[PDB]
Write an enzyme that holds these catalytic residues in place. Structure first.
Site, mmCIF file in Angstrom:
data_model
loop_
_atom_site.group_PDB
_atom_site.id
_atom_site.type_symbol
_atom_site.label_atom_id
_atom_site.label_comp_id
_atom_site.label_asym_id
_atom_site.label_seq_id
_atom_site.Cartn_x
_atom_site.Cartn_y
_atom_site.Cartn_z
ATOM 1 N N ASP A 378 44.116 30.856 43.785
ATOM 2 C CA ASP A 378 43.059 31.191 43.281
ATOM 3 C C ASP A 378 42.112 32.248 43.529
ATOM 4 O OD1 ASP A 378 43.620 28.953 41.099
ATOM 5 O OD2 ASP A 378 43.472 27.782 42.829
ATOM 6 N N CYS A 412 46.888 41.450 34.605
ATOM 7 C CA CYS A 412 46.129 40.318 35.267
ATOM 8 C C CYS A 412 44.880 39.791 34.170
ATOM 9 C CB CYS A 412 45.891 40.427 36.666
ATOM 10 S SG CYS A 412 44.912 41.812 36.913
ATOM 11 N N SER A 413 43.998 39.712 34.856
ATOM 12 C CA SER A 413 42.554 39.575 34.046
ATOM 13 C C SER A 413 41.918 40.776 33.874
ATOM 14 C CB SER A 413 41.625 38.701 34.733
ATOM 15 O OG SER A 413 41.051 39.339 35.818
ATOM 16 N N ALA A 414 41.272 41.394 34.801
ATOM 17 C CA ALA A 414 40.642 42.735 34.469
ATOM 18 C C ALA A 414 41.701 43.976 34.693
ATOM 19 C CB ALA A 414 39.417 43.080 35.452
ATOM 20 N N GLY A 415 42.618 43.740 35.480
ATOM 21 C CA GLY A 415 43.846 44.559 35.483
ATOM 22 C C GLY A 415 43.896 45.518 36.292
ATOM 23 N N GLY A 417 42.965 44.494 40.325
ATOM 24 C CA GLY A 417 43.257 43.881 41.414
ATOM 25 C C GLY A 417 44.687 43.719 41.810
ATOM 26 N N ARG A 418 44.905 42.221 41.283
ATOM 27 C CA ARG A 418 46.418 41.814 41.247
ATOM 28 C C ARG A 418 47.492 42.840 40.448
ATOM 29 N NH1 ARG A 418 45.106 35.280 39.908
ATOM 30 N NH2 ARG A 418 43.850 34.996 41.774
ATOM 31 N N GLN A 458 41.988 46.210 44.719
ATOM 32 C CA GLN A 458 40.763 45.715 44.932
ATOM 33 C C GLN A 458 40.139 45.564 46.239
ATOM 34 O OE1 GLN A 458 37.640 44.996 42.349
ATOM 35 N NE2 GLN A 458 38.870 47.010 41.900
#
Ligand SMILES: CC1(CN)CCN(c2cnc(Sc3cccc(Cl)c3Cl)c(N)n2)CC1
Length: 477
Positions: A378, A412-415, A417-418, A458
């Site tokens: 997480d 990912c989410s914001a696209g 970092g991961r 990130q």
């Protein structure tokens, strides 16, 4: 400038610095020492210093009481154009410059083993501690040393102007090169590359960075200031609510442009970018209102493999809407029709076999494989890269197995970092998969991909996870 970031100052060091060398409106940003990974925005107002926290857990820089951003530079840029941030209080420490380091003879070999005409670096003097040396290479075959004296807190090369920091000095002789008596011009064309290593060395390099990783990473961070390319389309009225994070946008020059869209006025936008070092589209987690747009992209770009690296929900937070039908179910998303043909569950991920087609014409069908990585922690990064690596390795063969496949979609989410950690690992092992006879330059690769999407790796944790990943892959050759 990005020299408004100070890598090694405490809070009080920053406060007094703002209150002694600055004015109201002066600001700076610094790494937080209370929480590794966090940063702090320090600003002077009315003769006092207010400190603003910025947390980055791996997905974005979250300024408290403000907005969420891709980089600290785009953050500062954003607020310097709309507590007022007027005057950057600039840092003189050179630890984060590409050219700063180191013995002379060792410096000469590197310049000989790795430099070209114009490669240079600055090191600390061994004859007179406090003074510095600028070693530069000229050729078509010579290395030149130029001593830099430190006098009363200012630096010079023996004559001319006195500088308040090496970066100023260096920047001055980049544009105004020294000319030696017989004509030789000491051009500072590029900093010497010391991060590109042979693949077989990764293990050696990783050990010495663990006694290093911090310095190299932030030296890469300092270079984000060169990547403030326009992102205007993503700010256009009709596009604001197509972004999951209003301030995390795609570069106009690498964004995917959706064509053949509904006659609505703006129908060509999606928070995605092509990543070309096999190519990638890096994108954010769908929203309810962009799901039809997501599949228009997948269709148009001939993508056959999607790689999603977040749960739908994390810590009760939503990160990506469900954009695929239930197993064995069929759904219509605007003009695009998707059937989930079968799902297979591994321990670390799920594979959904999805068939994508355009309603009305049964000659457009193509299988799309969605690899849903579900075990990312997480917060932080995995304690071990095996899971990620076997995942990506599976992903690659799937992609290599389909003729004429398009970009591999990663989200990912914001696209940033991961999603960026994955693509980069994927690019680097792509190389090593050429075998172990190859050079690897992680910073370089990260920077080349950040030039195509903002903020593409990130955190420092992720940065080291990339090293661990490549190391692990090399170990398994
Ligand atoms: C000792 C050091 C102090 N500052 C100086 C050198 N080292 C260093 C140098 N350059 C970068 S960045 C970069 C690298 C390659 C290609 C591109 Cl394009 C980029 Cl931008 C980096 N991350 N580390 C490590 C720290």
């Amino acid at each position: 400038s990005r020299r408004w970031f100070h890598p090694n100052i405490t809070g009080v060091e920053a406060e007094n610095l703002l209150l002694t060398r600055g004015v109201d409106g002066s600001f700076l940003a610094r790494p937080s020492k209370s929480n590794p990974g966090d940063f702090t925005l320090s600003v002077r107002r009315n003769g006092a210093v207010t400190h603003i926290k910025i947390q980055n857990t791996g997905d974005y820089y979250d300024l408290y009481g403000g907005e969420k951003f891709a980089t600290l530079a785009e953050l500062v840029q954003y607020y310097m154009e709309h507590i007022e941030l007027k005057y950057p209080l600039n840092c003189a420490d050179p630890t984060s410059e590409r050219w700063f380091h180191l013995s002379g003879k060792e410096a000469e070999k590197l310049l000989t083993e790795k430099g070209k005409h114009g490669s240079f670096l600055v090191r600390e003097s061994q004859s007179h501690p406090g003074d510095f040396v600028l070693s530069v290479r000229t050729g078509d075959s010579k290395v030149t040393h130029v001593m830099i004296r430190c006098q009363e807190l200012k630096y010079d090369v023996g004559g001319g102007e006195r500088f308040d920091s090496l970066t100023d000095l260096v920047e001055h002789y980049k544009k105004n090169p020294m000319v030696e008596t017989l004509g030789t011009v000491l051009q500072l064309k590029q900093p010497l590359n010391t991060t590109r290593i042979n693949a077989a060395e990764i293990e050696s390099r990783v050990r010495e960075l663990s006694k290093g990783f911090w310095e190299e990473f932030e030296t890469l961070q300092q270079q984000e200031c060169k990547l403030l390319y326009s992102r205007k389309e993503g700010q256009r009225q009709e596009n604001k609510n197509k972004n999951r994070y209003k301030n995390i946008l795609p570069f106009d020059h690498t964004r995917v442009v959706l064509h053949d869209g509904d006659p609505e006025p703006v129908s060509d936008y999606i928070n995605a970018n092509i990543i070309m070092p096999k190519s990638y589209i890096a994108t954010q987690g769908c929203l309810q209102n962009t799901v039809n747009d997501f599949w228009r992209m997948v269709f148009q770009e001939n993508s056959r493999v999607i790689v999603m690296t977040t749960k739908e929900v994390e810590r009760g937070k939503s990160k990506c809407v469900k954009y695929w039908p239930d197993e064995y179910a069929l759904k219509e998303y605007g003009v695009m029709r998707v059937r989930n043909v079968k799902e297979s569950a591994a321990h670390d991920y799920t594979l959904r076999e999805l068939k994508l087609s355009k309603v009305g014409q049964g000659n457009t069908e193509r299988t799309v494989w969605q690899y849903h990585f579900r075990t990312w922690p997480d917060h932080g990064v995995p304690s071990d890269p095996g899971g990620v690596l076997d995942f990506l390795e599976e992903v690659h063969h799937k992609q290599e197995s389909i003729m004429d496949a398009g970009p591999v979609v990663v989200h990912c989410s914001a696209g940033i970092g991961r999603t960026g950690t994955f693509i980069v690992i994927d690019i680097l092992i792509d190389i090593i998969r050429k075998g172990v006879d190859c050079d690897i330059d992680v910073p370089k690769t990260i920077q080349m991909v950040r030039s195509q999407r903002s903020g593409m790796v990130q955190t420092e944790a992720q940065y080291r996870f990339i090293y661990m990943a490549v190391q692990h892959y090399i170990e398994t050759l």
